[PDB]
């Protein structure tokens, strides 16, 4: 039984517990809380922070036995490697690599936005250059099941965490109908997956911490 | 022959540049060019962004035949894999998939203050948490000569990189001083990385973009 250490919101730890239902891992879960409005006291992870054995202590983090991991990345490679999830193929690892790290761009420039108090001056200019990001990741899976080819791996659950933030903002968009859409139904269709989300364990939302301008809930 | 384009900036690119010298991988330059203060047109790169064939056009690029990436993390990865310079071991893959992340994590904290306007009432906040960050790379390498075990691998040129930074930026820094100290000469002691560095290829200088309030040329 392994231990997931993350914020009782979704944030990044949404493709890791995602990971950890299909894969069938046995795990629990170390939800931190933050204090009140308008504090929001980090106390609960704080005097916690030092005594848990990390190399550099973070959120998310996860204690598998003597294993003991920071970085969401590094968590979801670690859970795919026990499971082949990985590239198999050297054309497969440039794909799993490339799109790793792009999705961190997409991932990342979105917080920045729903982070800023200039909110509403910012949201036109990244609608603007939205369509075309998303013509891209459109381009790149193309015709195909997933999206590093006929299996299956933890960068689908990136995919499909960061397509389904931008859903949630602006679920109009045309450019996310298509391929891309076929990609979020096949992907919420899988047999582990709708299980989890049938459940009461989902968390649909926040998406954010509570300090940000967007949220879901 | 490869390609590498990248701005006539150090930036991301220096690691990659480090690791195809120490590869001897034969390869030539894209250097990129602004224009004139204070405008800085980015015309020579926007002009080109689309034509390369890139499936998620950005800077670093790397073109090898018909490989042709994107994402400074993921064209490191690929040279290293042609190098066997990656993990080898359950432990070294955890070691290096943590470490790529984490040193990210510490080269874009330490980018967002130099780009900030606010540079100089954020700067003693900084400064504050950085030893810190410091003791625990320094506690995670140990007594071992390199920082992922016995082997070179390209996580070891991201880690001299940050702190190659943070040493131009600090120098007197105490917890700069002692294993992490003799890390930097060591990796400045390689045979191939210490004669590119008396070459005219060697770009210590800027490491950020000119519009930074920081910057060591
Ligand atoms: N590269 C690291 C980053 C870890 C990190 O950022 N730690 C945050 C997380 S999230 C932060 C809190 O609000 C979340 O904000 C976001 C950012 C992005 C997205 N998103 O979906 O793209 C959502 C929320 C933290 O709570 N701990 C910092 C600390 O203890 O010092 C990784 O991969 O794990
Ligand atoms: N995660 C990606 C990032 C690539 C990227 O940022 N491309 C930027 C500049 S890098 C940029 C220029 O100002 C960086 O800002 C900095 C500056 C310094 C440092 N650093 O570590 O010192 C990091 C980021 C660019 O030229 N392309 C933007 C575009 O084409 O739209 C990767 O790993 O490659």
Known sequence: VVTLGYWDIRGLAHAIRLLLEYTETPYQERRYKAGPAPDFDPSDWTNEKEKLGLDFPNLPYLIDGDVKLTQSNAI????????????????????????????????????????????????????????????????????????????????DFLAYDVLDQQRMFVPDCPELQGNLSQFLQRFEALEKISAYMRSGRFMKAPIFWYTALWNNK
């Open 76 to 155: 979801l490679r670690y859970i795919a490697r026990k499971h082949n999830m990985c590239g198999e193929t050297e054309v497969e690892k440039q794909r799993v690599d490339v799109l790793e790290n792009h999705l961190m761009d997409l991932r990342m420039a979105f917080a920045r936005l729903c982070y800023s108090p200039d909110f509403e001056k910012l949201k036109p200019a990244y609608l603007e250059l939205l369509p075309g990001k998303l013509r891209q990741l459109s381009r790149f899976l193309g015709s195909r099941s997933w999206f590093v080819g006929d299996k299956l791996t933890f960068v």
